Symmetry: D2
Subunit: 121 residues, 4 copies
């Protein structure tokens, strides 16, 4: 993949969170995510996909379900965005966080936000 080498590795967001990803030649993303905010402790599995054949950014997305051996926040976040390489490489994303709720509370089950990931803290 064009940006396979650029994506693989460790990324940090504006809040302190870290994620470590391997991009496969087949478009796969696999790794772990460690949050700095919210009901999250330690690492969580992440999986996703990217465009392996894009001047344009490389579109990608991934999911974390917020369950590991220390916490279950009954929720999942998806990040959708694009990787931009270079000396100031970035993964710029928007995200959706859905919490498991009763049907009566489903209208308020999904938060939206944005994260910018860089190679340095």
């Amino acid at each position: 993949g064009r940006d396979q080498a650029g994506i693989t590795g460790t990324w940090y967001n504006q809040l302190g969170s870290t994620f470590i990803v391997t991009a496969g030649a087949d478009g796969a993303l696999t790794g772990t995510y460690e949050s700095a905010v919210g009901m999250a402790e330690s690492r969580y599995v992440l999986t996703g996909r990217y465009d392996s054949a894009p001047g344009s950014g490389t579109a990608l997305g991934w999911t974390v379900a917020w369950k590991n051996n220390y916490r279950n926040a009954h929720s999942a976040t998806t990040w959708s965005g694009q990787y931009v390489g270079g000396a100031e490489a970035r993964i710029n994303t928007q995200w959706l966080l859905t919490v498991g709720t009763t049907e009566a509370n489903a209208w308020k089950s999904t938060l939206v936000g944005h994260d910018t990931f860089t190679k340095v803290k």
Copy 2:
């Protein structure tokens, strides 16, 4: 997983699209997605995660990168939502679709929408 059996199988959205998923005991989602709208032909790989231990819905998300052996739309969609079981089982989602763009066009790179998936067409 509590809803592993409920999630695994074939789901249809309000637009005609189909997706087929296997939920693993470990929280993994793997399968294929076939769209009915947009720049999409045939099946695309999908991967995601769900809460394996939630009255509450089961939070989940998944990603499709819109590249296969017939099309490359240089884009990825993530769906975030919850599975609700029963006779009228549903996966209710919001989604984010990011297109790879130049930096100048990044402000207009992400679409948002919603899909409701059911077990019958």
Copy 3:
């Protein structure tokens, strides 16, 4: 405005909420919104804008701050969408609900959802 007459009046969403709007020739929307869900009782002021000169839908949006003489939920919702006329007229929207929070909690301050409004309940 092309759809001024079509927009002006009373609309109902899928949850029971009601809103009453006047569309001005100048692109203004003014009216009241009464919710069926959440921390809301009675009517709230709404204001917005629409495209007065669009086969295409008419783009529009409006805001409600959730403060009236009975409740203050320290929050505001914006709806963005389009009006489609005809025998089955609809206003199809996505919405963002932001709650006032401390800076530490700002990452979780905005909910996202969707509402479909029709002329009949």
Copy 4:
């Protein structure tokens, strides 16, 4: 309103755009928005609402329909967010931009993004 004086005036986003707003004691926002990106030239009317009685930010939102005497982009943007006062005052927002489309293209009618407004450029 607690933050009426703090909100009233001129704000600049990260892209260069400017908006000038008057906050009324009754929760009204009125003013003009001038974009730096997209199909926009000169000023457009904006209207919105804010929480006049919130440590917490002040929730607010507003709408711009992208029609003036120079351009009609057949679209409207809503911003939802919160005002935070102080020496580094900010209005932090998410936004939804809906374009008028045919029914067949409605699934791709709404863009999502974020803007941070400050009192200095």
